[PDB]
Amino acid sequence: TNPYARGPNPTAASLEASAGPFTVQSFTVSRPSGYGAGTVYYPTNAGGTVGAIAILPGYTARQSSIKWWGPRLASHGFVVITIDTNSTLDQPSSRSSQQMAALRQVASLNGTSSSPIYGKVDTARMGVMGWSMGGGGSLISAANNPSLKAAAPQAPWHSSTNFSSVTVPTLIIACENDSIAPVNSSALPIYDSMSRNAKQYLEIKGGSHSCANSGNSNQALIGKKGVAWMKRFMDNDTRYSTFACENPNSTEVSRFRTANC
């Protein structure tokens, strides 16, 4: 029996819904350590410790762009911290450090007196996500910290697309019509560079650069896929293998590739 398995056998329906089976509370971090600001989303009733996900924004962007992931992932049994960077003009290298500082503080707060997430977190099981330079940041976090269990960046952008070092299971969410980080020059070369890992490329039909952001019209598809990947690889949850590795069954997917899943 998997000690990390939480909640039920999943269905397409249970994963496409706005919330999973866990009730969600949030708090604002009082004193952010090594990042601008943060909101932590947590399950009140997961039935065991759960892994932590740190989510980065893009250049100029703030929590509001990536906020929708917080309650979506928390409700399936993860501790999620959505962050603001020290500056909106921070580069992917700095964004990565800041995302690792956010996981560091969530982990600390698991043992911190008066913390709402006291003993809620398994600090050995952590995940990284983020939009654009925040996605680049997540990939740099993955390369520098191979004990990370899962990564799921969206519309990723970095100055280099060579992430062949990454051994962390990586879902690349891309927007087909993205003109800020075009899939041809960013999302796809990044995906292809990775030889040593379980990996997937999920491209959103008609999608502009914000196709995976808060308020997007594909939260059924994108939510299901992000939750399925994080469950399969953070929890080693083989009940999520089909949802994690299979085609989405969505008319709103323009391209789908997976290897070693």
Swiss-Prot record:
Mutation: residue 131 to A; reported impact is: Displays decreased enzymatic activity on PET film and on BHET
UniProt xrefs under InterPro entries: AB_hydrolase_fold, FrsA_esterase, PET_hydrolase/cutinase-like
Q: How does activity depend on temperature?
A: Optimum temperature is 40 degrees Celsius for PET film hydrolysis. Optimum temperature is 30 degrees Celsius for PET (commercial drinking bottle) hydrolysis and BHET hydrolysis. Optimum temperature is 35-45 degrees Celsius for the hydrolysis of pNP-esters. Remains active even at 65 degrees Celsius (about 60% of maximum activity).
Q: What main location does UniProt list?
A: secreted
Q: Name one GO cellular component term.
A: extracellular region
| Subcellular localization, as worded in the UniProt entry | Secreted
Give the superkingdom in one word.
Bacteria
Give the induction text: Highly up-regulated during growth on PET film.
Known pathway: Xenobiotic degradation
Q: Which Pfam families does this entry report, sorted A to Z?
A: PETase
Q: Which catalytic reaction applies to this protein?
A: (ethylene terephthalate)(n) + H2O = (ethylene terephthalate)(n-1) + 4-[(2-hydroxyethoxy)carbonyl]benzoate + H(+); (2,5-ethylene furandicarboxylate)(n) + 2 H2O = (2,5-ethylene furandicarboxylate)(n-1) + 2,5-dicarboxyfuran + ethylene glycol + 2 H(+); an acetyl ester + H2O = an aliphatic alcohol + acetate + H(+); a butanoate ester + H2O = an aliphatic alcohol + butanoate + H(+)
Q: How is it used?
A: Has potential for application in environmental remediation and biological recycling of PET and PEF waste products.
Task: Give the domain note.
Answer: PETase retains the ancestral alpha/beta-hydrolase fold but exhibits a more open active-site cleft than homologous cutinases.
Name used for this protein in its record:
Poly(ethylene terephthalate) hydrolase
Species of the source: Piscinibacter sakaiensis (Ideonella sakaiensis)
Supply the source organism's classification: Bacteria, Pseudomonadati, Pseudomonadota, Betaproteobacteria, Burkholderiales
